[PDB]
Amino acid sequence: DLFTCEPGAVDARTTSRIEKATRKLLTLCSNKRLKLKNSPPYLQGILFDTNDFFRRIFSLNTLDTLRDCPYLNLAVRKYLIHCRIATKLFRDAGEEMESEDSEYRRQLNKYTLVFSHMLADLQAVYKDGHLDADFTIVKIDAREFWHRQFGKRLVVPWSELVPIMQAELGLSEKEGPALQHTMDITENNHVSWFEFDVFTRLFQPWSQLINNWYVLALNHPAYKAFITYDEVEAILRHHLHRPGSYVYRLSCTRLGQWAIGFVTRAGKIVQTIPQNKSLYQALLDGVEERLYLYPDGKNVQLDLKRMISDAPQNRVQVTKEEY
Numbered sequence: 001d002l003f004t005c006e007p008g009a010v011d012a013r014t015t016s017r018i019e020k021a022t023r024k025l026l027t028l029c030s031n032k033r034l035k036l037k038n039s040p041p042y043l044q045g046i047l048f049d050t051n052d053f054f055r056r057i058f059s060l061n062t063l064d065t066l067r068d069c070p071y072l073n074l075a076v077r078k079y080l081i082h083c084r085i086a087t088k089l090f091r092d093a094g095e096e097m098e099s100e101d102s103e104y105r106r107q108l109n110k111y112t113l114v115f116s117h118m119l120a121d122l123q124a125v126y127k128d129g130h131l132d133a134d135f136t137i138v139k140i141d142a143r144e145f146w147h148r149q150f151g152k153r154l155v156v157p158w159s160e161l162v163p164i165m166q167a168e169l170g171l172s173e174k175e176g177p178a179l180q181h182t183m184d185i186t187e188n189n190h191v192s193w194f195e196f197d198v199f200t201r202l203f204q205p206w207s208q209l210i211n212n213w214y215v216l217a218l219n220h221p222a223y224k225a226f227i228t229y230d231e232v233e234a235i236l237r238h239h240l241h242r243p244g245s246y247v248y249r250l251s252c253t254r255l256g257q258w259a260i261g262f263v264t265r266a267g268k269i270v271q272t273i274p275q276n277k278s279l280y281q282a283l284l285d286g287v288e289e290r291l292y293l294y295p296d297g298k299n300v301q302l303d304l305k306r307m308i309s310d311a312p313q314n315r316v317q318v319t320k321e322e323y
């Protein structure tokens with residue numbers, strides 16, 4: 001496969017290769033013809049920042065120190081490959097790339113989301129440009145799990161993680177691909193400690209981790225995945241006459257945290273990032289405080305506890321073709 005942790009990608013020419021791939025792509029997405037907006041995820045800024053952050057790592061560490069790092073070799077390979085794919089996407093239908101609604105541009109907006117994740121992942125694993133050898137996964141149960149299964153390893157292949165999550169967390173095989181879509185956000189067939197940290201912060205509490213994921217990310221009408229602040233507002237404007245309408249979303253600038261948009265009792269649209277509170281609990285309290293009543297403006301009342309109680313049986317009835 002293409003994405004591997006073995007040494008060979010980190011050497012004295014790595015930053016040259018990273019810079020050549022980066023400007024090759026910065027020249028492409030520099031058409032003022034392209035209506036590319038600054039709104040995050042901002043592809044040009046990410047590309048600039050990522051090239052800059054690799055240069056920082058190679059200026060702060062000798063090759064002897066970087067050469068054999070499983071994470072850094074993976075991240076270099078993924079970046080160079082992702083630049084290659086994105087560059088080829090620009091080539092194919094150069095004019096159509098101007099078509100804001102084209103399949104080409106929707107693939108591009110998807111590719112810049114991945115770029116954004118890759119940078120946030122690199123900046124966590126190599127915090128301040130040095131290997132954070134004593135990384136701290138935030139949620140205590142996820143931290144103990146990673147330590148007990150993997151010790152101080154930075155990153156593990158998806159295929160090694162899957163049997164452990166089956167045995168310890170009750171994942172079934174058929175759910176694997178859907179799970180990888182949510183957890184392997186850098187899309188490199190591995191899960192770094194930071195991706196695992198992001199996922200376990202999102203779908204806490206640990207004791208219901210997979211069921212929370214199945215309900216909150218696969219079966220809740222309010223979930224809008226990675227959309228922008230403006231997109232949330234555009235949704236909710238349809239529902240100003242319906243106080244308690246709400247959606248929630250993931251934020252590419254705040255991995256591992258949710259944002260919730262709702263219509264207040266006065267008709268205002270409000271977007272918050274719940275402080276120090278899980279999405280599960282934020283939804284429970286918002287129903288109890290009568291803030292979050294109509295998921296996506298729809299006239300259905302969700303008993304979230306009941307949905308999580310019911311999720312083991314419901315997960316059984318979903319077949320392999322439905323995923």
Ligand SMILES: [Ca+2]
Binds near residue numbers: 190192195
């Ligand atoms: Ca990954």
